[PDB]
Symmetry: C3
Subunit: 156 residues, 3 copies
């Protein structure tokens, strides 16, 4: 039936840096993770069926004093949903979300989630990927960090 | 026709504590609140028809110095969208969102909202409910705190 | 086919005030901005076909110390999705989101994004618009600030 995907983060895809990076490991076969009529290729969600899709992502970041220090008090926690063309490899942000945070001292725990959503016209061959800042602060739970898409209607 | 629900907060389901609780009272028949081919049973949204639904929630929290003061300098405003099943009961988190906030001195007025959304496969008999921390800080307005769902396609 | 819109901010509709305003200039014809069987009239999205629609908005605010300073150390960064009508002079709030935030001159860069979404029953002639506080702090990129709608089903 109509294409779709709901992907949960695989805790492998997370270095120990602050640099913005493409998340490359997502489950598509366990818990809430599912996919149909679309292809997952190392963090790249390829469209197989032309259409107007509703796209979305939810990203939680967290930090507990107990787990150690971090280079700085002030973080830029951002999420970018990117479209890339297998044909014309031009790459652009479909959506952006996030917040600057002062997780400064004398607080045992800090947490913050970001969500984005939107309706976009997609062509088979096009790929959707997720980039985030501070990926070492990501919350690994499946109810926490995910992204997905579902076709609403055909190209018109 | 296809099932759906948009439920608004009934200011009754609001204790005076900071412990996380399931919100049990939502309207389904005034203002923007509505429901069709779905059943609301004391805070639980039961699925009637099997399908792939888009689920969402928006939750607003606020605080006035005039109202008094916060339980602590550092607060944790969170939302959890929980799924349950007839027999074989088992609370399962579908999504979570939130932030840690320092609500003190600053301005007699503090506010923060959270939103979560996602595409899930659902079976008749399963129930969607909402839990939040600091429920006594909820914004009672129908445009501030609500949750809902709408079927997108049949199970496949 | 079924109606929809995805509108992106036109940097014209941005005053230099802190006063809450209705954003009056959106693109419907370039980049990801698109519209089908809905009509844009200076900031309001008119519904032309009765239906149950999914509505959404993403708003991003940001500040560069190089741009000068913020009107207050503690800012109210809010968005309200409002419904008005071609006929009556009413004005109804459908969703609200936002946060109070300290951008107290220290860090050289501040950013914060908000997103809201919901399922609403709409009649031809009703119009959707966006109101935000601190409009001079809006991020003008098409992936940062937008709102839209897509019909899910006919009225019932």
């Amino acid at each position: 039936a109509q294409p779709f995907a709901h992907l949960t983060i695989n805790a492998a895809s997370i270095p120990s840096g602050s640099h913005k990076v493409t998340l490359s490991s997502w489950y598509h076969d366990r818990g809430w993770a599912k996919i149909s009529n679309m292809t997952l290729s190392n963090g790249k969600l390829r469209v197989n069926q032309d259409g107007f899709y509703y796209l979305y992502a939810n990203i939680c970041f967290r930090h507990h004093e107990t787990s150690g220090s971090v280079p700085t008090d002030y973080l830029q926690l951002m999420v970018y949903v990117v479209k890339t063309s297998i044909k014309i490899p031009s790459s652009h942000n479909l959506m952006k979300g996030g917040s600057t945070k002062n997780w400064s001292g004398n607080s045992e725990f800090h947490f913050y989630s970001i969500n984005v959503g939107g309706f976009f016209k997609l062509r088979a061959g096009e790929e959707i990927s997720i980039q985030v800042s501070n990926p070492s602060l990501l919350d690994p739970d499946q109810d926490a960090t995910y992204f997905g898409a579902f076709k609403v209607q055909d190209i018109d």
